[PDB]
Nucleic acid binder design. Structure first.
Ligand SMILES: [Zn+2]
Lengths: 121, 64, 182, 145
RNA sequence: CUAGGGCCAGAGGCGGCCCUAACAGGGCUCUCCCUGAGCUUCGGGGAGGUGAGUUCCCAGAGAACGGGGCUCCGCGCGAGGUCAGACUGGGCAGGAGAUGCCGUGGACCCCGCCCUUCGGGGAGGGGCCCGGCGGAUGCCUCCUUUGCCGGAGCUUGGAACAGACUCACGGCCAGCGAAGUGAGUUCAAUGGCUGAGGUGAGGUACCCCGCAGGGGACCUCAUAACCCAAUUCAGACUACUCUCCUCCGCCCAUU
């Protein structure tokens, strides 16, 4: 548990360096894309238990963790029934569906609010 | 037969290619050298012992 | 004892301070400045039988995001609809370049309720580039408390990381879900 | 998918070369504060093999290096922070706008810490450097420079 | 003892073509996966069809089937009012998104032209899903509501027409004790020395010819390493650098 806690610093260091690159200079994203590719390669080989919302904002198409917020498209629509948020990055032209709805708030708290509540030392 | 559509493939050509080096030439593919080292042995069989060949390239004009 | 460590990193981006009185009177000022001009916009849209329509009132999440993407000086009003509001308004938090994302937690539905319109607007913004709507609203814009986001760089050369290694227990989810397979 | 991801590129161009290198200065402060929060022990003296474990297991992406000995003399005398890392090379950026590609074939790099100086022989450090923190670092071979 | 063969069962035969029987072989073309300092039409490695089995924990509805969890919809069943368009009358939904535009996206359905008449393959049009942009009304003509069933959808996890591994598309059947390998030894021989030329280089007080020069002549250094044959050959492998044909990258200096 200690050696994995060591590599946690390296992984979120690469994650913070990607945010430093994307907050430093706009429209030239090669450093942050390479850092997110290295961060995904570490999680692909040394496979761990990562956080569900951050990793789904990493946009696993190629690599874009902060890019689809202020540069690429994240909007809402209603396709068939419940309304869906569409997340599309302008690099590999892939899409992400995420339904957001008030009747299912407990299922929005079913993976997330438990780990905040059941956290014991 | 499908391979023989291109080359000649004589009746004893498969027997030769089973244990002799067959190299393509001006006409068909024929035996250049034996697989086993017998350069002195071919002469020793040529002087006193028995030795044979395969001569099928000789085309024939029959005139009547 | 099945306990696995998980690298969870929600570096908590807390909202603006809960200044009840200041927000409470500036929102009433906004209601006064909206009711002081008139209702030609709904009469031009619904056509119950054009100058007030020229505002670009971005209503809905997608219109506010397409207003906040390109390059636009404007004001956004955000309310918390349900508990999943961080994912939707994370765009509004992240798009701080040249706009003001004012967020009111209890009060923005009570803004849409007396104003003659339709169903309760969750995210609102207005594009009013170079046209004079109300100068007092543009005086209120640098008076609201601004939000500082230390998630990216926070505009100052200073970086701080935090270590949040959560122990996920199998027993907790086991007793909450109560499922077995053989 | 890989050939479909290789359309535009993921690598640098001519346009990010002129990005006014003082903007890359907070990356050094980020790496320095990360070393300050990682090791967190300075004063008396402590365990250089702990330092070798930190220098083996951590990713060196975005760090200050300087070539101190190499087989090519023109490679030696080059400082700067590094930006990319590949199979047997890695790319750095230097002073007034120009970038250099240094190969990890037979060379050694001085790395300046907050209060320490470390020589790293870039011979065995290779092969998609996420493999370095993963597994398979054994004791083979010496490097004569 | 022609194994270009036969025997019980099988009707399956490892992407396609070409050569060889040395078919765990080589070459070309197409696709997929992974990686690479030449933007990439580049290079390297692995794989190609069919059938069966399997894939830490947590999470999730399902890691192979079905049910139990929720949401949306009704050529099916049922109940009530029956007050069934009255000033385009009533009801539902809609800024939490109805609709409009665009299509080298789908293993989907229908029409439809060409090769062809088993699985079929290709240009196009209509509906659903999908992505991009901007936003106000759409549904029905007696109406409304829950319950069963059917169809569709879901944020997770390294995984959900997937990917990866293993097994299978056959098994059995044929020897000669007599001389002596362009080296043939087995208590296990064979690249030993000298000199001139070959090639990579340097220097010139030598000779011949008249475009500053060119050609030949003299001296020195370097010609290594990997390793060693016991029956041969073909192919693949691994270990090479005096040596030659190309594709290249980085850095330094010049115009
Ligand atoms: Zn992506």
């Amino acid at each position: 548990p200690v050696k994995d806690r060591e590599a946690f610093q390296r992984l979120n260091f690469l994650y913070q360096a990607a945010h430093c690159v994307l907050a430093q200079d706009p429209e030239n994203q090669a450093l942050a894309r390479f850092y997110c590719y290295t961060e995904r390669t570490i999680a692909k080989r040394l496979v761990l238990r990562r956080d569900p919302s951050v990793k789904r904002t990493l946009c696993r198409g190629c690599s874009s963790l902060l890019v689809p917020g202020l540069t690429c498209t994240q909007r809402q629509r209603r396709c068939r029934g419940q309304r869906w948020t569409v997340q599309t990055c302008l690099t590999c032209q892939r899409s992400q569906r995420f339904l957001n709805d008030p009747g299912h708030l407990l299922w929005g708290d079913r993976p997330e609010a438990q780990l905040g509540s059941q956290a014991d030392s | 037969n499908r391979r023989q559509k291109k080359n000649i493939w004589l009746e004893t050509h498969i027997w030769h290619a089973k244990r002799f080096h067959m190299v393509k030439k001006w006409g068909y593919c024929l035996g250049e050298r034996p697989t086993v080292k017998s350069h002195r042995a071919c002469y020793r069989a040529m002087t006193n012992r028995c030795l044979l060949q395969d001569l099928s390239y000789y085309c024939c004009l029959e005139l009547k | 004892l099945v306990v696995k460590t998980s690298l969870n990193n929600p570096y908590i981006i807390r909202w603006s301070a809960l200044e009840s009185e200041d927000m409470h009177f500036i929102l009433q000022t906004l209601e006064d400045r909206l009711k002081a001009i008139g209702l030609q916009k709904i009469e031009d849209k619904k056509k119950k039988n054009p100058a007030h329509v020229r505002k670009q009132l971005a209503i809905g999440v997608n219109e506010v995001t397409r207003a906040l993407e390109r390059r636009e000086l404007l004001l956004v009003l955000v309310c918390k609809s349900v508990k999943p509001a961080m994912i939707t308004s994370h765009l509004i938090q992240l798009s701080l370049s040249r706009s003001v994302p004012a967020c009111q937690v209890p009060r923005l539905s009570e803004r849409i309720a007396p104003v003659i319109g339709l169903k309760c607007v969750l995210a609102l913004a207005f594009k009013k580039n170079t046209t004079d709507f109300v100068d007092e609203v543009r005086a209120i814009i640098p008076r609201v408390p601004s939000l500082s986001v230390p998630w990216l760089q926070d505009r100052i050369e200073d970086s701080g990381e935090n270590l949040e290694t959560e122990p996920l227990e199998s027993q907790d989810r086991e007793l909450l879900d109560t499922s077995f397979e053989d | 998918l890989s050939a479909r991801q290789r359309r535009e590129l993921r690598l640098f161009d001519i346009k990010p070369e002129q990005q006014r290198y003082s903007l890359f200065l907070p990356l050094h402060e980020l790496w320095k504060q990360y070393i300050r929060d990682l090791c967190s022990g300075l004063k008396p003296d402590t365990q250089p093999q702990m330092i070798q474990a930190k220098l083996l297991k951590a990713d060196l992406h975005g760090a200050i290096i300087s070539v101190t000995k190499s087989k090519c003399p023109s490679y030696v005398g080059i400082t700067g922070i590094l930006l990319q890392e590949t199979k047997h090379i890695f790319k750095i950026i230097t002073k007034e706008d120009r970038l250099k590609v240094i190969p990890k074939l037979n060379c050694v790099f001085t790395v300046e810490t907050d209060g320490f100086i470390s020589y790293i022989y870039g011979s065995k450090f290779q092969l998609r450097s996420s493999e370095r923190s993963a597994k398979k670092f054994k004791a083979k071979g010496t490097i004569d420079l």
